[PDB]
């Protein structure tokens, strides 16, 4: 219902149509992340690094515990939350707190193994309880780089290297678990960020937990797999995190259409239409979509939320075959698409690029009246555009070239120029208002 043929005359050539997907129905998996390595094999060399590291780690961790206790103290046995005590909170925070309280059963079950959790010296261990996987930070580095050379190097270099490693790990961790994270009660934190505790390789975490699907990569890349912190221990220095595995559910009667832009010629100038590239047609209701937060694959578009945004009535009126309402922007740069191929036909502003056929050896020319030139079998089979030769047919109107259409007014999309345009516009409006008042 977009009248693609009329849009193609102003450089908006129909592109690839994709389906729309959104996450739903997560599955929960608990995992412990021990934040302090075990150095029982090389304790002769620790010195005072461990004390300072523990002090700094406790300083980092305590605010998280203080924030979580706010929602753990009040919630009582469904589940009733005392609104008075909480005071101020949004809906997402309330839902996250409800989930956190619901997770307390598994949190206690995991905590029952506190003695065994603290006494693990390995990168990844499996403790039977259902089984729970205990990870460790820097325990692989200590095991395979420092312990082997305990006898080759002095106990002053080992201590210094361990201190440097701990400091670097803390520096990396502070970016995520520092003062920036002030909303622990929320399930919108991606596993990629949460993996900074273990060292930055979320692949090991996901493989250990166990992912069962073929589209796992698409879920992972679009920030659709998130985790939550359900318990923090200030004594053994470990946090239990719950990972959510959702499933993509394609939405029905909804698809995203992409429009490839092209620069057309008018009044001896190259212009580009200013129209959104991605259009979300859902239930025959056109609207915009925020693509910055949405992953784009070859056959579909995946988002973790519904990003549809209202679109101004003028845009919807224009996309439905009314080119008078679509603005244009002048082109001064020399690097802008000048031709585009769709469905086998070639739409190309044929004045700027030396477009010239091959079979008959003549040249393809366009008069100043035309905006874009369409080339297909009828004109001639093979087209020699610049330095590339190319070889279909057009299923639309037969007399596409000699039609002509009205075009809209120009605009400027520079960030600074918006303010100047608004100010001058107002200046003009005020003058007209004063003139009307005078007479």
């Amino acid at each position, epitope marked *: 219902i977009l009248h693609y043929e009329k849009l193609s005359k102003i450089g908006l050539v129909k592109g690839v149509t994709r389906k729309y997907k959104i996450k739903s129905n997560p599955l929960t998996k608990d995992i412990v992340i021990k934040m302090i390595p075990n150095v029982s094999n090389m*304790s*002769q060399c*620790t010195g005072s690094v461990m004390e300072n590291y523990k002090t700094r780690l406790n300083g980092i961790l305590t605010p998280i515990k203080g924030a979580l206790e706010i929602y753990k103290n009040n919630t009582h046995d469904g589940v009733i939350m005392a609104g008075v005590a909480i005071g101020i909170a949004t809906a997402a925070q309330i839902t996250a707190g409800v989930a956190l309280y619901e997770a307390m059963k598994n949190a206690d079950n995991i905590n029952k193994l506190k003695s065994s959790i603290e006494s693990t010296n390995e990168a990844v261990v499996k403790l039977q309880e259902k089984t729970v996987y205990v990870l460790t930070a820097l325990q692989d580095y200590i095991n395979t780089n420092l312990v082997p050379t305990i006898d080759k190097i002095s106990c002053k270099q080992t201590e210094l290297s361990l201190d440097l490693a701990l400091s670097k790990y803390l520096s990396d961790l502070l970016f995520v678990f520092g003062p920036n994270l002030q909303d622990p009660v929320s399930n919108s934190m991606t596993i990629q960020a949460i993996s900074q505790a273990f060292g930055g390789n979320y692949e090991t975490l996901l493989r250990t937990l166990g992912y069962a699907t073929e589209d796992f990569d698409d879920l992972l890349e679009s920030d659709s797999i998130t985790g939550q912190i359900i318990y923090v221990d200030l004594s053994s220095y470990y946090i239990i995190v719950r990972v959510y595995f959702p499933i993509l559910t394609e939405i029905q009667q909804a698809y995203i259409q992409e429009l490839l832009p092209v620069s057309f010629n008018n009044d001896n100038s190259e212009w580009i239409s200013i129209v959104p590239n991605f259009i979300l047609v859902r239930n025959t209701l056109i609207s915009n979509i925020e693509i910055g937060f949405c992953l784009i694959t070859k056959r579909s578009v995946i988002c973790n939320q519904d990003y549809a945004t209202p679109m101004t009535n003028n845009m919807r009126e224009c996309l439905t075959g009314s080119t008078e309402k679509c603005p244009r922007e002048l082109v001064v740069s020399s690097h802008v698409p000048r031709f585009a191929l769709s469905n086998g036909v070639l739409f190309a502003n044929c004045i700027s690029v030396t477009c010239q056929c091959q079979t008959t050896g003549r040249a393809i020319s366009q008069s100043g009246e035309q905006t874009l030139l369409m080339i297909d079998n009828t004109t001639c089979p093979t087209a020699v555009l610049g330095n590339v030769i190319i070889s279909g047919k057009y299923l639309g109107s037969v007399n596409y070239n000699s039609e002509g259409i009205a075009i809209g007014p120009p605009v400027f999309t520079d960030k600074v120029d918006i303010s100047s345009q608004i100010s001058s516009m107002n200046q003009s409006l005020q003058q007209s208002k004063d003139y009307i008042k005078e007479a």
Partner: antibody
Amino acid sequence: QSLEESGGRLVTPGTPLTLTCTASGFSLSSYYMMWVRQAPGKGLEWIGIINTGGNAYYASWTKGRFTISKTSTTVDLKITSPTTEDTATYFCARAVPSGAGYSAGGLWGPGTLVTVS
Amino acid sequence: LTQTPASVEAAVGGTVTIKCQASQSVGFYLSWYQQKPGQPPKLLIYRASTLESGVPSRFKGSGSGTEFTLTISDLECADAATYYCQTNDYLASSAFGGGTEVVV
């Protein structure tokens, strides 16, 4: 708790000799077992250490004339090609478990005088 | 790697200082012992600042790279015997130092 060690009678040069530490009251695999020597009226001298496993490191000044071994609940320092220089009161000590470095000598044995003819 | 304690102080009723310096840097790792005649040495200080449990509040020594010194604040008859300062940095080779005589 006391690292009682068997002594060694005077032996003619050129014959092997063996000493042992009859450790009791504690686990012998938890800590290193360093060996020290003191010639009469002279300063202490280091003659090697043994890891928890079977890996013993020796002093530079000894050309592999000693042998450090570990038994289930005892350690042994066998000597080869003894000479007049070997006479001393050998001591058996256990390194401090942590916080001091290698060969901290937290606890020491009574010592035994291995004289040489 | 090499030690050279030379104080041989013979003061009675007052503070006595013993000093030893390693040939090369040894970091903060060095232990001070005590050996009365006819008895095995007993650890007094390890890491050059820490006191082994049991020793009195005195026997406070300190220092830095290849320079260490132990000071016996409150001296009495019971504290008179040989003193040693062992380097305990390398696992491969740790060596003692020359004996010292307080001879109170």
